[PDB]
Write a protein that holds these residues in place. Structure first.
Motif, short mmCIF file in Angstrom:
data_model
loop_
_atom_site.label_atom_id
_atom_site.label_comp_id
_atom_site.label_asym_id
_atom_site.label_seq_id
_atom_site.Cartn_x
_atom_site.Cartn_y
_atom_site.Cartn_z
N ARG A 165 -118.44 2.33 -6.64
CA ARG A 165 -118.74 3.16 -7.84
C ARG A 165 -118.92 2.23 -9.05
N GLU A 166 -118.12 1.16 -9.17
CA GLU A 166 -118.08 0.22 -10.31
C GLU A 166 -118.51 -1.19 -9.89
N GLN A 167 -119.47 -1.77 -10.62
CA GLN A 167 -120.05 -3.11 -10.39
C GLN A 167 -118.93 -4.17 -10.33
N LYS A 168 -117.89 -4.02 -11.14
CA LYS A 168 -116.84 -5.08 -11.32
C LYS A 168 -116.14 -5.32 -9.95
N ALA A 169 -116.06 -4.30 -9.09
CA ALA A 169 -115.32 -4.33 -7.81
C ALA A 169 -115.92 -5.36 -6.84
N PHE A 170 -117.20 -5.72 -6.99
CA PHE A 170 -117.86 -6.73 -6.13
C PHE A 170 -117.23 -8.09 -6.38
N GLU A 171 -116.68 -8.27 -7.57
CA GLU A 171 -115.99 -9.54 -7.94
C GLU A 171 -114.88 -9.86 -6.93
N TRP A 172 -114.25 -8.86 -6.29
CA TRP A 172 -113.10 -9.12 -5.36
C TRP A 172 -113.48 -10.18 -4.34
N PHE A 173 -114.72 -10.17 -3.84
CA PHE A 173 -115.13 -11.11 -2.76
C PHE A 173 -116.54 -11.68 -3.00
N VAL A 174 -117.02 -11.71 -4.24
CA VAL A 174 -118.31 -12.38 -4.62
C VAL A 174 -118.35 -13.85 -4.12
N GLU A 175 -117.26 -14.60 -4.21
CA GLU A 175 -117.22 -16.00 -3.74
C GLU A 175 -117.46 -16.05 -2.24
N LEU A 176 -116.74 -15.24 -1.47
CA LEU A 176 -116.92 -15.14 0.00
C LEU A 176 -118.38 -14.79 0.30
N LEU A 177 -118.93 -13.79 -0.39
CA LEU A 177 -120.32 -13.37 -0.10
C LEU A 177 -121.30 -14.52 -0.44
N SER A 178 -121.08 -15.24 -1.55
CA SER A 178 -121.84 -16.45 -1.98
C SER A 178 -121.73 -17.51 -0.90
N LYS A 179 -120.51 -17.86 -0.50
CA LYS A 179 -120.28 -18.91 0.52
C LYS A 179 -121.07 -18.53 1.78
N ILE A 180 -121.07 -17.26 2.18
CA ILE A 180 -121.84 -16.79 3.37
C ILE A 180 -123.33 -16.95 3.08
N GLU A 181 -123.80 -16.61 1.88
CA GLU A 181 -125.25 -16.77 1.55
C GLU A 181 -125.65 -18.25 1.67
N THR B 25 -111.58 -4.72 2.82
CA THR B 25 -110.65 -5.84 3.13
C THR B 25 -110.66 -6.21 4.60
N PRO B 26 -110.69 -5.28 5.57
CA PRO B 26 -110.64 -5.69 6.96
C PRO B 26 -111.88 -6.52 7.25
N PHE B 27 -113.00 -6.14 6.66
CA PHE B 27 -114.28 -6.85 6.87
C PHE B 27 -114.27 -8.18 6.11
N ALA B 28 -113.58 -8.26 4.98
CA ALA B 28 -113.39 -9.56 4.30
C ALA B 28 -112.74 -10.51 5.29
N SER B 29 -111.70 -10.07 5.99
CA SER B 29 -110.94 -10.93 6.93
C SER B 29 -111.86 -11.39 8.06
N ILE B 30 -112.68 -10.48 8.58
CA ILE B 30 -113.57 -10.69 9.75
C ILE B 30 -114.67 -11.68 9.33
N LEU B 31 -115.36 -11.45 8.21
CA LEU B 31 -116.39 -12.40 7.71
C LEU B 31 -115.78 -13.82 7.57
N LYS B 32 -114.62 -14.01 6.92
CA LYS B 32 -114.01 -15.37 6.80
C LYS B 32 -113.80 -15.94 8.20
N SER B 33 -113.30 -15.13 9.12
CA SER B 33 -112.95 -15.62 10.47
C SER B 33 -114.24 -16.09 11.15
#
Ligand SMILES: Cc1cc2nc3c(=O)[nH]c(=O)nc-3n(C[C@H](O)[C@H](O)[C@H](O)COP(=O)(O)OP(=O)(O)OC[C@H]3O[C@@H](n4cnc5c(N)ncnc54)[C@H](O)[C@@H]3O)c2cc1C
Ligand SMILES: O=C1NC(=O)C2(CCN(C(=O)c3cc(-c4ccc(C5CCCCC5)cc4)nc4ccccc34)CC2)N1
Length: 255
Positions: free
Chosen positions: A163-179, A131-139
């Motif tokens: 550990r679980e693939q589903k957890a990437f869903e939390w910020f897949v949109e952010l990671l996509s937008k960055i890609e 989460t802290p890195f989610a905030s930093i990437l958006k900024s």
């Protein structure tokens, strides 16, 4: 800064995570990487629990928190918010959604905010440690669209273990937008399951080979300084600390 606000909205997200949206007081400034303490009288009259602000301060009316049900207080807040939302699928339209009243105290800093003053940064995180890195990437996004080339930050190596693939869903949109928007190649995104995401960056498998990763990053940026920022378990922090000494990278003891 103590204030009586409200959860105005929430998402329920894989791996028992709440995407809390919290009404941001007029006076509440924060920097990416900041956390706050939150009290929820409906859960516990007197307990305060710290959570990263997963939002960037450029977003103007709400703070975000992403909170994973891991025990007593987070388990209860999950059940409260699930129940209030169910109650509304069944019979909610009459009046708008009632806000959960909460108190917030902060913001409080971490040395992660120094990332914007670094030339080269490695961000390593496990689970909701993102989460802290989610905030930093958006900024960092807002700050290139706004003031390009006013940032000393030249390369961000990002590693996110789950550990679980589903957890990437939390910020897949952010990671996509960055890609999509990172034509200039500021970011090196690396997802590890310990593409599979639907990103251009393929989800890798097993524990990363941290020795090989540090060696490569050292080679790219020699003889300049590289700063490691970590949010994750202590077993990994010991390995990272040894590697930061071997290659001459910045380490903050936080585990
Ligand atoms: C700066 C900061 C930022 C944070 N940011 C986030 C964030 O963004 N998102 C997030 O989800 N969390 C975050 N956390 C964690 C968070 O603050 C919560 O308090 C904690 O995650 C859960 O509180 P709880 O009562 O639900 O759990 P607890 O009931 O306190 O349980 C906590 C953990 O310890 C274990 N445990 C409980 N009792 C025992 C025992 N007797 N013996 C051994 N193990 C035990 C539990 O099983 C669980 O693994 C952050 C913490 C800090 C310090
Ligand atoms: O999803 C996870 N996988 C994990 O291995 C853990 C362990 C639980 N974790 C935390 O409780 C946690 C601690 C911390 C944390 C705790 C103490 C510190 C202090 C900073 C000031 C003094 C030094 C350490 C800093 C960060 N930050 C988090 C941010 C977002 C999500 C979780 C945390 C992170 C990694 N979570």
């Amino acid at each position: 800064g103590s204030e009586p606000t409200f959860v105005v909205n929430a998402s329920l997200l894989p791996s028992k995570v709440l995407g809390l949206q919290v009404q941001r007081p007029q006076s509440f400034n924060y920097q990416p990487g900041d956390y706050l303490f939150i009290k929820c009288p409906g859960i516990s009259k007197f307990e305060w629990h710290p959570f990263t602000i997963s939002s960037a301060p450029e977003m103007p009316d709400v703070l975000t928190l992403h909170i994973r049900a891991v025990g007593s207080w987070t388990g209860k807040l999950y059940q409260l918010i699930r129940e209030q939302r169910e109650e509304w699928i069944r019979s909610g339209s009459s009046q708008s959604l009632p806000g959960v009243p909460v108190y917030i105290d902060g913001p409080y800093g971490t040395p992660s905010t120094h990332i914007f003053e670094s030339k080269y940064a490695i961000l390593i995180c496990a689970g909701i440690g993102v989460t802290p890195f989610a905030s930093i990437l958006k900024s960092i996004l807002h700050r290139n669209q706004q003031n390009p080339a006013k940032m000393p930050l030249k390369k961000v190596h990002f590693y996110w273990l789950n550990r679980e693939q589903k957890a990437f869903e939390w910020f897949v949109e952010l990671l996509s937008k960055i890609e999509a928007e990172d034509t200039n190649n500021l970011f090196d995104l690396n997802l590890y399951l310990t593409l599979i995401t639907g990103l251009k960056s393929r989800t890798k498998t097993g524990r990363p080979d941290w020795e090989e990763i540090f060696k490569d990053v050292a080679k790219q940026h020699a003889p300049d300084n590289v700063e490691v920022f970590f949010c994750g378990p202590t077993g990994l922090a010991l390995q990272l600390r040894h590697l930061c000494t071997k290659y001459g990278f910045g380490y903050r003891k936080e585990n």
